[PDB]
Amino acid sequence: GLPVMNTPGSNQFLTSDDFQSPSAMPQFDVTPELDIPGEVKNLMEIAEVDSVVPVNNVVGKLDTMDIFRIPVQSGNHQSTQVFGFQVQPGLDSVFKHTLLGEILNYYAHWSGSVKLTFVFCGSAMATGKFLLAYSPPGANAPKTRKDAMLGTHVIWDVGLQSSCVLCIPWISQTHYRLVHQDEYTSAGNVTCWYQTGIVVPAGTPTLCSIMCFVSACNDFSVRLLKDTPFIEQSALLQ
Amino acid sequence: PPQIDNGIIQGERDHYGYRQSVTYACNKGFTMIGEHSIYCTVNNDEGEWSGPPPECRG
Amino acid sequence: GDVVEAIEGAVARVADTISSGPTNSQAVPALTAVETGHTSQVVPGDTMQTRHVKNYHSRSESTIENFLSRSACVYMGEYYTTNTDETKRFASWTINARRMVQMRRKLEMFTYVRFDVEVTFVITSKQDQGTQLGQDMPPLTHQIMYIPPGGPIPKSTTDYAWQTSTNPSIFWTEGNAPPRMSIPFVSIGNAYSNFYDGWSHFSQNGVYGYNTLNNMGQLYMRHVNGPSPLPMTSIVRVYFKPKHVKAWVPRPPRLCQYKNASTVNFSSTNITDKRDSITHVPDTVKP
Amino acid sequence: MGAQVSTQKTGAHETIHYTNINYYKDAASNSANRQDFTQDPGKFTEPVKDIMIKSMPALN
Amino acid sequence: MGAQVSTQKTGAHETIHYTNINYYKDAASNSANRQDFTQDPGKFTEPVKDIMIKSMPALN
Amino acid sequence: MGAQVSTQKTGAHETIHYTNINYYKDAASNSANRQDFTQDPGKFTEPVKDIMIKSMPALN
Amino acid sequence: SDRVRSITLGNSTITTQECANVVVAYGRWPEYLSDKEATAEDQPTQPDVATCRFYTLESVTWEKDSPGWWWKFPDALKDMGLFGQNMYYHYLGRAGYTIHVQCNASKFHQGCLLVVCVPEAEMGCSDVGGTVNEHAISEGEIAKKFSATATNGAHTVQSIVTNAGMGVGVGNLTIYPHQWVNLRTNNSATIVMPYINSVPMDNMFRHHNFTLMIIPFVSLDYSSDASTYVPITVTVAPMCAEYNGLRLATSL
Amino acid sequence: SDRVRSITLGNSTITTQECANVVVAYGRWPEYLSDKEATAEDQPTQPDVATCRFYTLESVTWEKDSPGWWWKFPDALKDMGLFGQNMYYHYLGRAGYTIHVQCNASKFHQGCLLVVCVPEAEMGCSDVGGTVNEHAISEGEIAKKFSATATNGAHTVQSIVTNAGMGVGVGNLTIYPHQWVNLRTNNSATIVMPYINSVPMDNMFRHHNFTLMIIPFVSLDYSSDASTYVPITVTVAPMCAEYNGLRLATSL
Amino acid sequence: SDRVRSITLGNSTITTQECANVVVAYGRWPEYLSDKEATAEDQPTQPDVATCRFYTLESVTWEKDSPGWWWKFPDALKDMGLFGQNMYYHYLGRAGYTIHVQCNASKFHQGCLLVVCVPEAEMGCSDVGGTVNEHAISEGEIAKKFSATATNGAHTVQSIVTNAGMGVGVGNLTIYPHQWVNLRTNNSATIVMPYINSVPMDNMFRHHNFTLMIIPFVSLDYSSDASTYVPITVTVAPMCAEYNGLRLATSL
C-alpha cells in the first residue's frame, strides 16, 4: 500500500480532460486504413476556402439566390454606394453563415487578415471600375467615395480577369478579436463605390451583378472553442 | 398591402406574389417605428403578408 | 530510448507578415479568376504596404483532434427502479450520434470520420414525488450492457441476457466517479459515414441514408438492487469523446434545423438574417 | 518504464516537459493526440492542375 | 512526426503504401489491426501428442 | 510481426513470458497497463518543505 | 495560351478554347486499386477503353429563371454502353471521373453557373416526416431540377435551390470540387474526381458516390435580338474503372 | 530553531515564531504556465507584486462550541485590490496560494484545529432534492460556518461538521493538504497550494478551485480568569498569478 | 507604399491606409525605468498587455467653425480598464504613449488640423486674478473645447484658440511633437511620446504629463450635397507602463 493523497478534481468529469481509459473491447482488430481523398487536419484549411457572401440580405430575398448578387448598372450612379457592411466575420448576418463565419462561431477569438474576392458577372462587353474600401474602426462608415478612398482601398478594373481581391489586413489593438464582436473589438467596415461608371454597348444588358467571396488568409487563427449559437433543439430524436 | 397613417407605400404594384415585398416610407416630420418593408407569404394556396406595416408617429 | 524517449515539439505557427514597399509593375496579385475553382493565395503585402510582423499565433485549437476531442452528450435516457410495467425499469439505446444536435452538427462537418471513442456515463437518480418519501435505500448500482448486433436483447431486469458472459458490461454504484471506457474504431468499413447517399437494397429502395451503414449495437441499462420500496428514476447521460480522429471530405455546416435522426429532412431555411439595406452600416460614433 | 517525454504547450514569446506512460495494452485506450499540427490547405484551395502563380494574370 | 508507413491491401497478381500517425495518447484509441495474418490451425486440428504422419496408417 | 514479449505475473519465491501483438490502429484499443508499479507516497505523506529526519525531535 | 485544353480518353476527345483550368478534386487523380488496399479477392475487370471514355448526357436549357439541375453520377451512366453493362453484370465497381460542363454563349450574354461535385450528397424529403424515392433523387441521364421555392410533395426532394436539397447554405457549396462558368470568361468547366468512399469499391446501383450540381448564381441575361436558347451539356468520362463480383445482370 | 519562519511576498511579510512547518500541497510549488501546456493564445498579464501579496480576511471567533468555518478561495479575494480587479477584467485567471492561518492563545488554553485546503470541495444542499445558492457556499471574505447538527434549509448547505458539507468522513479530511493548529504546540499553519485543475486556466468567478476549512477537532478550552476571546485570522497570498482574456468588467 | 501602417499593442490593432509617418517625440521611444535612474525601492508592476493597449476616447465633431479640443492625457484614461485601475491603486505610475488621431473625409472636403502633444501644458484662468478648477482643464474622455474669442469666466481657462490657453502663439505650437491632418493628404496622425518629466515617476492623478491638442488651422470646408458630419477620434495606447506604491484606491 503506497501512501497517496487525493487532490481536488478527483472523481470529477471534466469534459475537456485527456486521460487513458480501459478498452471495452480488448485486442480488437481495427479495419485497415484507406487513403481517402481530402483529409482534413485543421479547420483553417476549410476556412481558407472562398464562400459566396450574402451581401444582398435585404427583406424578401433571404430565401432566393438574389441574396448573393450586388446589383450594379450603367448611368450616373457615383453618388450611390454599391454596398457596405461591417467586418464582423462571425457576428454580421452577412458573414455568420459563410464557411469562414461558420468555423468562427465554434470559437471565441479570431485573428488575421480576411480576403474578400469580388467577381463581375456582366457581359464581356460591359466595362467598369470600382473602388473597394475597407475603413478601420474609430470613424463612422464613409458616406462618400471621397471619404472611402482615405481608407485601405483597391481600384478594381474589370477586364479578362473577372475578380479582384480586397485583403482586409489585421489592423487591431489586440492580438485577437471576439467572434461575438462588441465595440471594443470592432474591425471597421467595407464599402464599394463606382470609380469610373459602367459603360456598355447597345443590345447588351445594362444592369449586371457582382459576387462576393470571403475567405481567411494564411495568418488567420482561432481560439477558445465554444458551442455554436446556431443549432438548437427542443427535444431529443432530432 | 395595407396603407398606413402618415406614410406611403413606395411605388405600389398591382399584384404581389410569393416573397414580393412592399416598402413603406413615412412623410416628412414623422418617425418610422417598425419594419421598413413587409413581404408576401403563401401557405395552403393562400397569401398573407409577413406582418404588420410600420408606424409613422409624429 | 529504453527508459525515456524524447519527442520533438511539433509547434506550428501561422505565417508571418513580410514587409512590402511600394510597387509599380505588371504583377497583379489582386487580379485573379474564381472561375478556376482556385482560392487566391494573396497576402496583405500584395495590396498594400506592410511592415514586417513576426507572428506567434498557432492553429492548434482548430486541429481536427482538438476540434472534436470534447465529450458531448449523445443520449439521455430514463429508467425506473420500480414500476408495474417492466420495459420501464430498464433503458435501451441504439448507438448513434444523431439525436443530440450539437455533436451531430459537429460530426457532419465531414463526410467520413475514423476515431476511437471515450464513453463516459453520467448516471443520476432522483426520488419520485409521492405521499411517502421516507425510506433508507442502499446505494444504487447500475449495469450498462453493450449488446453488439445479433446478441440477445433483454426483456426484463431479471433476464438471462444480463449474464453478460461475452458482451462488455460496466457495473457502477452511485457516489463514485462517472464510468468511462474506451472503444476502438469498430466500423466494418474503412471509416464511419456521416452521410450515405444510397439505399440498403440493390433495387434502389428500402432504407435511404445513414441507417443502412449504421449498426454498432445497442446499450441497455438497469438497476441491480432490484425494486425500491418507493419509486425512483435514474437518468443515464452518454458522453462521447472521439480521439485519434481522422476526417475526410469536409462539408458545408448544416444550416437548417435537424428534424429527426433517421434522415437529413429539413424545413427550408433562409440563407441568413435580413438587414435594412445593402449599404447599411449603423453609426457607432455619435454623441 | 517506457516513458515518453514531450514538450508542453507553452507560449511562443514569454520567458518544459511532461511525462507519459501508457498503462493499457490497446492503443484505442491512449490519450488524444492533441499536438499534431501538420497542414495541407492545398487540397481545398488551389485544387487545380496547372498551378497558378499569383503574380501572373491567371488567364489568357 | 512519428509516422508509420505500411503497405496497402493490393492484389497478388495484377500489375503502394499508406501513412498513419497516432494522434491520441491511449492505445485503445488507435485503428484496428486489420493486417495481422499469422495462423496456427494445429491447436484444433491435430491436437494430439504422437504426431500423425499422414502417410503411415495412423494406427497399429 | 511487431511482437512484445514481457514477463507474466508469477510468484516471488516459488520455483516465464507472454506475447502481445497490437492489432488495432488506435492506442485507446490496447489492453490495460496492468503492470506499471511505480510509486510516490511522498506527495501525500511528508508533503512539507523542510524535510523531517524521523530521528530528530521534529520540532524546536 | 492556357485557354485551350484537349482531353482524350478512349476513342473520345474534347477540345475547349475557353478553358478556365482543370480542377483535380482534392489534388488526387483517379487510380486503380492496389493490393495493400483491396479487400475483394477475385481478379478485377479493367476494360479501360470500352468504359473509360466521354459520355454525353441530355442537355438542359438555361433559361432566365432556372434554379439549377443535378445528377447522381454513378447512376445516370447505366445506359452508357459498356460502362452500363459492366455496372449491370458486376456486384462491385469503382471509377473516377472527368466531368466537363459545356455552356457557350455570346459576348453579350451574362450569367454565372456554379458546377459542383458533391460527395455523398444525401438529400431530404419535402415532407419532413417522409422519405424520398429513387425517382425523386435521380432520373438517369435526365437532370433533376432545383426549385426557386420550397417544394411540397411527399416522397420528393426539398429542391429549393438555396438549401441544395442538403439542408445547408448554397453559397458554401464551394467547399467541394467546383468550378464557375462565367459567361464573360468561360464556356466550359472540368473537374477530375478520384474515387471517394469509405470503402475501396461499392455497388454502382445502390450507392450514389457523388452528385453533380449546376446552379446559376447570376441569372442568364441577354438583351433582345440575341439568342434566347442557351443549352448546358454534361460530358462524363469514367477513369480507372474496375469491377468485381461478376454474376447475372441486375434487373431494375 | 525552525519554529521561526518569515514569508515575504510583494510588499507583505508574515513572521511566525511557532511555525510547525510549511506544507507544500503535493510537493509542488506554484508555477507559471508554460508553452507546452497553454491553450489560450493572447499574451498573459503577470502583475506579480500588485497581486501576489498577502491579503487578510476578516477574523473568526473561536468559541468553546464552534463547529468550524470555510472559504471558497478563488472567490473571497474579489475585493482584494488589484487581485480582485484583474479577476474582474479578465475571462481567465490562474494562481497558486500561500494560506497562513493565525491563532495564538496562552500556554493555559487547549484546542486543536484542522486547517485543510480541499480542491473542488463541491457541497450538497440541506434539502436532498434541492440545489444550493452561491450565497450558501460562499460569502466572500466572510467565513461560512459549519454546524454541530444537521441543517434544514432549502438552497443552503448541509453544514453539519461531521460530514464537511461533502458527504464524507470529517476525520478523513487529512487526505488533502492540511495542517493542525495545536494550541500547546502552534499558533500558525501555512499551506502552499499550487494551481490544481483539469484545465490550465479557468474563470475565477465561475469555478471554486479550492475551499479552506478550519474545523476544531478538540474544542477551545481554558479555565476561568483566562482570555475568553481567541480569534482566527486567515492570510492568503496569490502566487504566480496570471490572467488572459481581457474585456470589460463582470458586474455581479 | 509607406502610406499603410499597422500598429499592434496588446490585443489591439490600428491599420491606416493614409499614414503620413510616425512622429517619435524627441527621437526617443518609451522605455522602462532602469536601476541607475530609479528612486522608489519596491518592485514595480508591469502588466504590459492589460494596460499597454489602444483605448478610444469619445469622438468630436469637426464643424466648419470649431476652434479646437484638448485632453490632459495621464488623466482622461482613468476609466480605461486596467490602466485606470492601476492608476487608482498605485501612488506612482509611468508610461509613454502612442497617440493616433483619426479623421477621414472625402476627396472633396478641405481642412487642416494640427495635432500637438504639449508637455506640461499648464493653463491660465479667464480671470487674470483667479485660478482654474480641475474641471476647467480636463473632463476625462470628454474633450475640452477651445474658443474662437476670449472667454470670461472665473475658474475657467482662457480658451481662445490663438493663445492655446498657454499665453503663447498658437502657430508656434509646432515646437512640440506634432503632426498635421491635411484632408487632401491624410486621415490619421500618430505621435509616439516617451515619458517626459523632471522625475522618473509621478502620481498619475496629480500631474498632467502632457496635453493633446487638436486645432483646425484651415477650417473644415466642403460644398453642399457632401457629408456634413466629420468626426475626429483619438486612440491612446500606454506604453512601457509601470506602477509603484500600491495601497488602497483613491476616491475622487
Chain A residue with minimum CA distance to H248: A184
Nearest Cα of chain E lies from the Cα of C65 at a distance, in angstroms, of: 7
| F47–H contact, CB cutoff 8 A | yes
- Please report the DSSP string for C69-100 in residue order: -S-EEEEEEEEESS-SSSTTSEEEEE--S-SS
Residue H20 DSSP SS3: coil
Distance CA I3, CA I17 (A): 6
Q: How many domains does chain A have?
A: 1
Closest listed residue to residue I14, CA positions, set C57, A151, A192, C59: A151
Using the beta-carbon criterion (under 8 Å), do A60 and B19 form an inter-chain contact? yes
Nearest Cβ partner of E36 from A20, A29, A35? A29
Nearest Cβ partner of D8 from H34, H43, H44? H34
Q: Dig out the grid coordinates for I100 from the structure.
A: 493616433
CB neighbours (10 Å) of residue I92?
19
Q: Please provide the size of chain A in residues.
A: 238
CA distances from H40 to A175, D11, D32, I230 (A): 12, 9, 19, 39
Using the beta-carbon criterion (under 8 Å), do I107 and A169 form an inter-chain contact? no
Closest listed residue to residue B1, CA positions, set B19, B23, B18: B23
CA distances from H234 to G70, H28, H38, H210, H213 (A): 73, 22, 31, 15, 11
User: Quick check: is I252 in a domain?
Assistant: no
User: Quick check: is H227 in a domain?
Assistant: yes
CB neighbours (10 Å) of residue G144?
21
| F44–H contact, CB cutoff 8 A | yes
Nearest Cβ partner of A29 from E25, E28, E33? E33
Distance CA C232, CA C124 (A): 10
| D40–C contact, CB cutoff 8 A | no
Q: Number of helices and strands (H, E) in chain I? A: 2, 13
Closest listed residue to residue H74, CA positions, set H138, H26, H4: H138
Residue of C7, C55, C58, C137 to mutate when probing chain H, most H C-beta within 10 A: C58
Contact partners, residue I83, CB within 8 Å, separation at least 6: I50, I51, I55, I77, I238, I241
Chain-centroid distance, C-alpha I190: 10
Chains D and H touch (3+ CB pairs under 8 A): yes
Distance CA C279, CA A197 (A): 18
Chain H residue with minimum CA distance to I49: H45
Using the beta-carbon criterion (under 8 Å), do C244 and F24 form an inter-chain contact? no
- Please report the DSSP string for I54-88 in residue order: -EEPPPEEE-TT---EEEESSSS-TTSHHHHHHHH
| D15–G contact, CB cutoff 8 A | no
Nearest Cβ partner of E26 from C65, C182, C185? C182
- Please name the residues between 102 and 141 in chain H that touch chain C, using a CB distance below 8 Å: 129
Using the beta-carbon criterion (under 8 Å), do A16 and H118 form an inter-chain contact? no
Q: Which helix (H) or strand (E) holds A47?
A: helix A43-47
Nearest Cα of chain F lies from the Cα of C48 at a distance, in angstroms, of: 48
Contacts of I4 in chain C (CB under 8 A): 48-50
Distance CA G125, CA G155 (A): 6
Q: Please provide the size of chain C in residues.
A: 287
Nearest Cα of chain C lies from the Cα of G135 at a distance, in angstroms, of: 9
Nearest Cβ partner of A68 from G150, G183, G217? G217
Segments in chain C forming alpha helices (H)? 44-47, 64-68, 101-107, 210-213
> Residue G149 is part of a domain; what is its CATH number?
2.60.120.20
CA angle C262, C249, A68 (to 5 degrees): 85
Residue type, G54: F
In this structure, are residues G117 and G191 in contact, taking their beta carbons and an 8 Å threshold?
Answer: yes
Secondary structure of B6-27 as H, E, C letters: CEEECCCCCCCCCCCEEEEEEC
In this structure, are residues G26 and D43 in contact, taking their beta carbons and an 8 Å threshold?
Answer: yes
Contacts of F25 in chain C (CB under 8 A): 185, 244
Chain H residue with minimum CA distance to D10: H35
Chains B and A touch (3+ CB pairs under 8 A): yes
- Residue H165 phi/psi, 5-degree rounding, is 65, 0
The position carrying cell 490550465 is H200
- Residue I236 phi/psi, 5-degree rounding, is -125, 125
Q: Please provide the size of chain I in residues.
A: 252
Residue of E5, E10, E34 to mutate when probing chain A, most A C-beta within 10 A: E34
Residue type, G119: P
CB neighbours (10 Å) of residue B43?
8
Distance CA C112, CA C116 (A): 14
Chain D residue with minimum CA distance to A164: D57
Nearest Cβ partner of H34 from D6, D10, D13? D10
- Please report the DSSP string for I231-250 in residue order: EEEEEEEEEEEEEEEE-SPP
- Residue A59 belongs to what domain range? 1-238
- Please report the DSSP string for A77-102 in residue order: -TTSEEEEEE--TTTSTTTTTSHHHH
- Please report the DSSP string for H101-125 in residue order: EE----TT-EEEEEEEEEET----B
Distance CA I1, CA C19 (A): 10
CA distances from H16 to H1, H99, H113, H187, I220 (A): 12, 13, 17, 8, 70
Distance CA A142, CA I104 (A): 8
CA distances from G136 to A144, G146, H141 (A): 51, 11, 69
Using the beta-carbon criterion (under 8 Å), do D16 and H38 form an inter-chain contact? no
| H42–C contact, CB cutoff 8 A | no
User: Quick check: is I251 in a domain?
Assistant: no
Q: Which helix (H) or strand (E) holds I115?
A: strand I110-119
Nearest Cβ partner of H41 from C9, C11, C57? C57
In this structure, are residues A20 and D30 in contact, taking their beta carbons and an 8 Å threshold?
Answer: yes
The HSE-up count of residue A71 (CA atoms within 13 Å, CB side) is 16
Nearest Cα of chain C lies from the Cα of D13 at a distance, in angstroms, of: 7
Q: How many domains does chain H have?
A: 1
Q: Dig out the grid coordinates for A22 from the structure.
A: 480501459
Distance CA I139, CA I79 (A): 12
Contacts of F24 in chain D (CB under 8 A): 26-28
Distance CA H5, CA F4 (A): 54
- Residue B47 phi/psi, 5-degree rounding, is -90, 155
Distance CA I180, CA I215 (A): 10
User: Quick check: is H126 in a domain?
Assistant: yes
CB neighbours (10 Å) of residue A15?
12
Contacts of D30 in chain F (CB under 8 A): 26-28, 30
- Residue I203 belongs to what domain range? 5-246
User: Quick check: is G251 in a domain?
Assistant: no
Reported structure resolution in angstroms? 3.1
Distance CA I127, CA H9 (A): 52
Residue H152 DSSP SS3: coil
In this structure, are residues H46 and D16 in contact, taking their beta carbons and an 8 Å threshold?
Answer: no
